[PDB]
Amino acid sequence: LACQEITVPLCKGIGYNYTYMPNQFNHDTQDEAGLEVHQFWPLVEIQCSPDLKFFLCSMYTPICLEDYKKPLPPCRSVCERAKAGCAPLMRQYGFAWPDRMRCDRLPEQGNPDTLCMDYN
Amino acid sequence: LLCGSIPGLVPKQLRFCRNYIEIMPSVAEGVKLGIQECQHQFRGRRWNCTTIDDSLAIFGPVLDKATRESAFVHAIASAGVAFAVTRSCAEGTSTICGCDSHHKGPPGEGWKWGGCSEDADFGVLVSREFADARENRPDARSAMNKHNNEAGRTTILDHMHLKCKCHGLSGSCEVKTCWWAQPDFRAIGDFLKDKYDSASEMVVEKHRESRGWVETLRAKYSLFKPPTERDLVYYENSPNFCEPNPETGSFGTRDRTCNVTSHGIDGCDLLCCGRGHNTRTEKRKEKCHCIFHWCCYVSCQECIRIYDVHTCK
Ligand SMILES: *[C@@H]1O[C@H](CO)[C@@H](O[C@@H]2O[C@H](CO)[C@@H](O)[C@H](O)[C@H]2NC(C)=O)[C@H](O)[C@H]1NC(C)=O
Numbered sequence: 001l002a003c004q005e006i007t008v009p010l011c012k013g014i015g016y017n018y019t020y021m022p023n024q025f026n027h028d029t030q031d032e033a034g035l036e037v038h039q040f041w042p043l044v045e046i047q048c049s050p051d052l053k054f055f056l057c058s059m060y061t062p063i064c065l066e067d068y069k070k071p072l073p074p075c076r077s078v079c080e081r082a083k084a085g086c087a088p089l090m091r092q093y094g095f096a097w098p099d100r101m102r103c104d105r106l107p108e109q110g111n112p113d114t115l116c117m118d119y120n
Numbered sequence: 121l122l123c124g125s126i127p128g129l130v131p132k133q134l135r136f137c138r139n140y141i142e143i144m145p146s147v148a149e150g151v152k153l154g155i156q157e158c159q160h161q162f163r164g165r166r167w168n169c170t171t172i173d174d175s176l177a178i179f180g181p182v183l184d185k186a187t188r189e190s191a192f193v194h195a196i197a198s199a200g201v202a203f204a205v206t207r208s209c210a211e212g213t214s215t216i217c218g219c220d221s222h223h224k225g226p227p228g229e230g231w232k233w234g235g236c237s238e239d240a241d242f243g244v245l246v247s248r249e250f251a252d253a254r255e256n257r258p259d260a261r262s263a264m265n266k267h268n269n270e271a272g273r274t275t276i277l278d279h280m281h282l283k284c285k286c287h288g289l290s291g292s293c294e295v296k297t298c299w300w301a302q303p304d305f306r307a308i309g310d311f312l313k314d315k316y317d318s319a320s321e322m323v324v325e326k327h328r329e330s331r332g333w334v335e336t337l338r339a340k341y342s343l344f345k346p347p348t349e350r351d352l353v354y355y356e357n358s359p360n361f362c363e364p365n366p367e368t369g370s371f372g373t374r375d376r377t378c379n380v381t382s383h384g385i386d387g388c389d390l391l392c393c394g395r396g397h398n399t400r401t402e403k404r405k406e407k408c409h410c411i412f413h414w415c416c417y418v419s420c421q422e423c424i425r426i427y428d429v430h431t432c433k
């Protein structure tokens with residue numbers, strides 16, 4: 001409910017400053033979320049996808065708006081761009097795209113039931 | 121102060137209130153939680169459960185009519201208490217209860233025990249001792265209420281299940297941590313609503329013990345499987361909730377909100393018991409054509425949605 005400022009270093013500077021908790025992963029405090037998304041920092045650093053960072057935080061530190069309080073996830077397209085760019089890397093070591101970033105759970109542009117974040 | 125509101129409080133109860141003063145707020149919320157769910161479970165029926173008072177006054181003398189509905193009210197009140205007491209103790213912070221710490225057997229393979237398992241046993245025992253501090257009557261109504269209170273309690277135990285957190289790399293569920301936990305209270309309300317639909321009807325018999333005549337309940341229809349400790353019992357016929365009951369049964373259905381689409385009870389032929397229904401139209405303002413903007417905000421347009429509300433005559 002309450003919008004709290006984003007503290008996790010990775011997700012500072014992504015274009016929105018305010019999140020809420022708990023997120024979709026039942027992270028109770030924003031630090032607990034942080035200690036997971038920061039495991040992705042090497043992937044952000046390699047620049048396999050230029051959407052990776054925004055996509056990650058759009059799930060771990062979801063945008064929180066004073067004006068509008070309905071769901072606002074990333075669009076499936078954002079995730080799909082990120083998966084296209086970075087899953088190959090993880091596969092070279094035998095790892096699948098993580099279950100938590102499964103893109104098919106996310107809405108597409110034009111969903112009546114909910115809006116979604118992506119550029120155009 | 122607290123337990124004061126109870127209108128036939130006996131000293132055994134007051135002692136309990138004072139011994140367990142630290143968890144009496146959660147007993148009170150327990151009752152409020154159960155009656156809230158009652159009102160949800162019957163949100164569209166002729167009797168919508170807004171008769172019932174949500175204070176601790178429900179503890180103490182049970183004198184309401186022995187209808188199926190009461191069987192459900194008291195059941196879900198007991199369960200609410202067992203629920204909210206267990207939930208509160210799990211929130212830590214209290215001297216006389218907390219998480220269930222007793223050694224749980226070796227875990228399933230993927231996971232380790234952890235977190236805070238809810239002490240459902242403590243809540244059930246609190247529910248029972250407080251109800252049982254009531255003065256004891258050889259009443260038929262007291263035999264029914266002892267039965268249904270226990271059915272409500274016991275399913276708080278029955279509904280304990282496993283809940284696990286997944287941590288390890290990127291949240292992968294291969295480092296798992298589990299604890300015993302309660303469902304949402306909605307599971308409880310749905311469960312008891314079913315038990316309400318199958319409640320066994322009884323008849324009253326009486327035999328003497330050393331303190332005079334006691335009354336016991338016996339299944340009215342012997343050919344069926346008798347009710348169990350988890351089933352609801354009752355022995356008076358429920359009234360006709362159509363008309364305002366002059367014997368304070370309840371109100372009529374007049375000006376209760378109605379559904380033209382439905383041909384069940386929440387529909388306007390059945391809810392209004394063959395009387396007509398009025399209709400008025402209303403307008404609310406709301407946000408409707410909200411565009412997202414890259415980045416990152418949302419813009420909304422104001423528009424006026426119109427609907428019609430049918431209320432029974
Ligand atoms: C539950 O039932 C009662 C009455 O059956 C409803 O309360 C009445 O609502 C009508 C119309 O709003 C009023 O004329 C009365 O003053 C209300 N209060 C009474 C009789 O005490 C109540 O709104 C119903 N609630 C539901 C269906 O949620």
Ligand SMILES: *[C@@H]1O[C@H](CO)[C@@H](O)[C@H](O)[C@H]1NC(C)=O
Pocket residue numbers: 015016017416
């Ligand atoms: C978030 O805070 C920074 C200042 O550190 C500011 O430059 C940025 O524009 C802010 N974001 C929004 C959406 O206001």
Ligand SMILES: *[C@@H]1O[C@H](CO)[C@@H](O)[C@H](O)[C@H]1NC(C)=O
Pocket residue numbers: 379380381382383
């Ligand atoms: C009215 O009844 C119809 C059919 O049962 C149902 O689909 C609809 O959701 C009901 N309206 C409300 C507000 O429940």
Ligand SMILES: [Cl-]
Pocket residue numbers: 190191192194195264265266268269
């Ligand atoms: Cl009862």
